[model samples]
Target chain A: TAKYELIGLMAYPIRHSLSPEMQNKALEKAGLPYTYMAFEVDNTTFASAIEGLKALKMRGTGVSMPNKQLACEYVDELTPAAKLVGAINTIVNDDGYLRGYNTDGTGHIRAIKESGFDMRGKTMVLLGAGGAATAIGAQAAIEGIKEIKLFNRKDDFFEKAVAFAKRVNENTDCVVTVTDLADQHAFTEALASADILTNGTKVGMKPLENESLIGDVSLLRPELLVTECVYNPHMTKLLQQAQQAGCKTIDGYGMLLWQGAEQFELWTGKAFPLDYVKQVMGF
Target chain B: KYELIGLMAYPIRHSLSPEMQNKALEKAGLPYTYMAFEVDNTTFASAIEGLKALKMRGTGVSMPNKQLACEYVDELTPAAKLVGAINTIVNDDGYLRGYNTDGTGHIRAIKESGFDMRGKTMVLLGAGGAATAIGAQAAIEGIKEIKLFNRKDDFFEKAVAFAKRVNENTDCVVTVTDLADQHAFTEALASADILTNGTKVGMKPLENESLIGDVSLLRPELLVTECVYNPHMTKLLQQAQQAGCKTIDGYGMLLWQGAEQFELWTGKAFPLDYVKQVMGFTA
Candidate 1:
């Protein structure tokens, strides 16, 4: 209910900005009357950004890592469904009004749907239960994506993580199970039959992180469509394996893009652009 | 020993003095090199005295420095005295002479862009050291009407001081706007035919990458020019590009203005063609 022509996106290493290029092109192609920009911020000074936006007459902002978690607590309004994810990917600046919302799960669902895979009555794999996977898994449950199994590297992680996964799946038309990281058979056998395999884990994040969750992905059947959250080194090990197996691969970057797109819609009260996705956030 | 060309300022990593002057040395085949040195603003008095001892070729003054280069300098050229700000300081036989080249840079740019300043309406954005030189220079050029706009009231005094120095009665009017309101931008843009940005807004290509009006409120037909030179094509330049508006690159102004300082220091004609190549610039 406020009028603003300028908006910003926040992240570290922001000097090498691509959002400006993306958003500016989008503004022109979409015939919008606003411009998008980028800002550098960390946890210590994150609050200052919100204050600056109001003081500077900014319309909205997209929050990135190290700021997203803390920003969640400040949103004037939150989607009850997004609360399950417990993170905010978008922030809106209105006159004496600001709100936060999470579009991450919905973005993931849309990406999965676009892949032409039937999640209905199919076994699903959730690689990481920390923050991202848990949220997307919860939404998957509601979408009738039952027979889901969550995988993580540590026994301690599984102990605390199972409860959160259950909360998202509870009473949904789905059921989720947790398993150990080293369980090779569980990964191979479960994923072999999975309608969709998701690597919620930070595998293939580059700089030589850990391998994909579905280890020896050669064991993965071509029928399994795979999803990974890693975008930096855009091609993750898990995604490579899935593609090698002739399975449709969904990138984790898409999740980030989708979530942010949803946030844009929530603030602007409009649907996010699908065709311009590559032009805006594809980089 | 490399001929010492003193650069005077507190925390002046922004010293283009070195690159600018050194290019002239190489062209003239002089046994000289320009280097940047930091001096505390509080002890600028002592710092100026040191220049005499160094047997300096000349000194270049930068931000947080008096436009007039008050002490340790003998006399000001008409332009420097007119603006009372010294960006280019030259030492003649132990006595330092101050010169202002910022206006020359802007004037040169306006001419290069093929825009007639004879009667065009100019909107000067961000009042500071830059505004002093640029505004004064614009007045000298024959711009029909000029207006100043900024975000802070404290900076307004500086703008007023500029008017008092360069008395060009082009019916020039200076105006400050509430950056927090869109109405201010709307009113300003309607009358401004050429928008000149002197602030650090577009320096980072991300932060405040567009004009205060963002790309949305920009008079698409108006020519846009900014004083930020790094990255060649700044975010503001990109915005102007999208709007199908002509732009004057800051680098052009930076190099030519620097060339003037070099010529003043050594009484040697600066080969701008050679300097542009050294700076990897096309123009």
Candidate 2:
């Protein structure tokens, strides 16, 4: 048996995930006998990975990618935050009583807060109605945002956004709207009135790093708080263009780090060394 | 996604391999972690299959599972095949390459004590798998005679069969001496250059107990070594030292065996002295 605590991450194609390096460094620096690893596990072996957590009696894990939604069924319980997000990004196995949690929304909020932007009563123009946008927008609703305008390229995605917005509207005071990205007037109207603008689509992601979903970069204003949920290269073109237009921008790295920080806290029952974590992130 | 290594066996809680192997890996500046996996015989097959599926860098097999590991591997090194057991396996792509470092590690331990096996008669107490590995290799390495003592019955008969096979395969003469006949063992030790205990006599939880009930037979000039490591200085070693015999503790065998296994996994020569000092082994 290991005297050092064991923790890991589960996601397919996780070799490039920075969690291992970041967590290990912080763990070592904090003088807590802990080590983390990233395991590439698809749905075929997701159950086995969870079994390992219990069978091996590992401390905890950071769950990601395709397994986020699929893992809810395997967990014995869900955190209120995870339940609200309708997904899980972390798991805490307390003596085989598995508990699922979502740190994606927490990460986004932390990133937004770190950038001096408050979600409370703020209008957010969330680009795309996919998993990223849904996670952030839904959590923003619960975080007391005034309104959220979700823009999507597909009808099916719009339906999902509408459904999520309806649920939040009925349960809370937040206003939610679904709009077509192809409708120039509606997209422009959403951007013009929004206080916070976030790109949750893959437009400024790797291999398409030069592209942005925002058709007119000039629409970015100094008062607008911009954020992009893509971390590769650390600075997405959307964030860079937002900065060039004098708008404050928060890169996706903070969200990644904060989500990881929250997961670390849930697993270890202690705060991860934030200073070291940020150092590892080169922030 | 992980470069981490694993060791699996039943009752693995007592294993010191993680400390030994992890220290070695860190000293070499290798990016990997070694962890022990506790598994029962029933789950052994599934556990091993998971290792192959994970394509783990390597794994070490231990008691109750070492011999069984041979059949599950894709290929075996000659020593592992000859010993009819495997203590280590390296996963190359999807192929599990089995290897037995026990016999070789035992030889290193002997040499570490400054004892030369050339033409020496060795009296090995216990006709079990551990003795078989050491004796067969010693004989092939040019030992003059191998006297293996065991209690009578199916176990003794099994020892005789094993001795016969070794005798036919190596140049050394092999003999199965009856443990009930104390006089034979006494006489064998007088003529033997080396004495080794392969049984679990003086190991922990059975501490201070000697399998060699007739301690008077221990020769002052004879060189002795053992395979029991928990107590470090087993009663047999303590008795041998009291008798003025040159002694080698089981820690050497543990260290060398792990060093040899590490070499197999990493394709690099292990620095035994460094690993020894790090593991608190003087030899």
Candidate 3:
């Protein structure tokens, strides 16, 4: 029996899950007797996750990467934000009615827009085209970008980023550019006058993990504001090198923590754990 | 869809019949809803007009409306027309067919409780519309003989008139007599195979009081039924239970009256299991 009441979780390959420990600490502070339990999603057992929540009358689900889109088909409804992003990191069951919501893009914008930099008439470069990249890239193009450059290592990935931004711009009427990672020299010259630079990729997520997607930080100029989307070893080696070179750096730690916090709020209808986030992620 | 079910009564604040009837409709796969509309003495005419306009299916008359309903409808079944009142009205495709289902309802209780009323002497205690309804119906069911007893002179007259008309219409013999004296009524009970109570004196609000008839005179083969639903198993039913005499609770008559009227309106099988569930029973 759970001493704390209400929700639980369904996550697989769970390691260093700050969720249970952190969420409990916050609930305790709010004088709420609520606790969450984690369940591993494997091939044989994932189907039971949907049944268990319905039978138990669970209120919400917090999904991590890989399973974010998968949770959509399992839920009863989708919030517009989730529909817009084509992704869902949170599933809230409101009185037996389940709905999905995405908070990833909002997280990226919250981190970058708070940098005290003016975004009007600025050109930004958004790198990579995966889940996080797709979110951050789309968000960057919408928030007052004049000519946004979308870059990726692979040729096929370059096309996806360019098209995604153009569609976002078609809605917002912003000019978009599709570029490649090989043009580092032209990118550096381009960044000298650019308002913001974003790397929505995570090559430096761990030691010997992979090199930074933006391998050479020479693209950075004094006026270019840089944000990298790599949370683990939160202070990426790229950001450290850029910082030593006297440039303002926005680390992925800020985006990761903020996005997770927003996802928490979407799922639970509670304020994100600001103090816990500030202390743990040094935001 | 079963047509209009008029709950002909005054101040029906807590009627579960509507909910019960709707469940019956659902179980029988009928697309209809049952509702309760209050009809008092003053509103009775207007209610009938509304029912006419609404093409109401049927009605279950109660208390004062039973007698008034007899005067309001176009045509009545022989028993209802003879009894000068109706507790149930069948609205057959805009045509009102009034009938007293109390006889079948009572006979069902007797048979279901292991008693045979056929070719047996029965004493009915009461002379109101309800008593007359039973008197008229009992004759149609081929009861060998029936004694109608009422304490009041005017009420006893109503029963006598009802018996006179029933005797004219059917072959069975029914005698109307005022058994107001306690000794005479108690003596009358000894010859009764079945005795039914239909007076307000033995019902819900006045439950602390005993029945007008003697329980000691009741035999193992005796059957009794009271047709009132809140504080549902009335004091009379309790007396029968204590005496170990076969008896029927009010729900039987209540359910049957609804079934009869519903059949007249829509010719559909009233689902008893679903109806009971709505009345807060597993059956």
* Share of reference contacts found in each model: 0.00, 0.15, 0.00
User: What is candidate 2's CA lDDT for residue A6?
Assistant: 70
Q: Which segments of model 3 are wrong by more than 4 Å?
A: A1-283, B1-8, B212-214, B281-283
Cα RMSD of predicted structure 3: 16.4
Candidate 1, residues B72-177: lDDT per residue as tens digits? Answer: 5688765666577778777676677777788888778778778888777887777777766787677767776666677656776766666655664334454555
The TM-score of candidate 2 is 0.84
The superposed Cα distance between candidate 3 and the true structure at residue A59, in angstroms, equals 38
Give me the runs in candidate 1 sitting further than 4 Å from their true place: A1-4, A15-18, A155-160, A169-174, A253-257, A267-273, A276-283, B1-283
Top lDDT hit: 2
Give each model's clash number. Answer: 5, 0, 5
Which CAPRI tier for candidate 2? acceptable
Model-by-model DockQ, in order: 0.02, 0.25, 0.01
Score residue B172 of candidate 1 by CA lDDT.
Answer: 45
For residues A140-213, write the lDDT of model 3, one tens digit per residue: 55566677776677656666676676566566656766667777776666666676777777567765345655
* TM-score-better candidate, 2 vs 3: 2
Query: Model 1: per-residue lDDT, tens digit, A1-283?
Result: 0111555676564554444565556556656656565655667666665654554445777777767778887668766555656667677877748777656677788788877766777778788776677667767876777678887878555765677666665646577788886887777777666777787766677565556655565767777778877776778777777888898788866776666566556555555565786755544
Candidate 3 matches the true fold with a TM-score of: 0.47
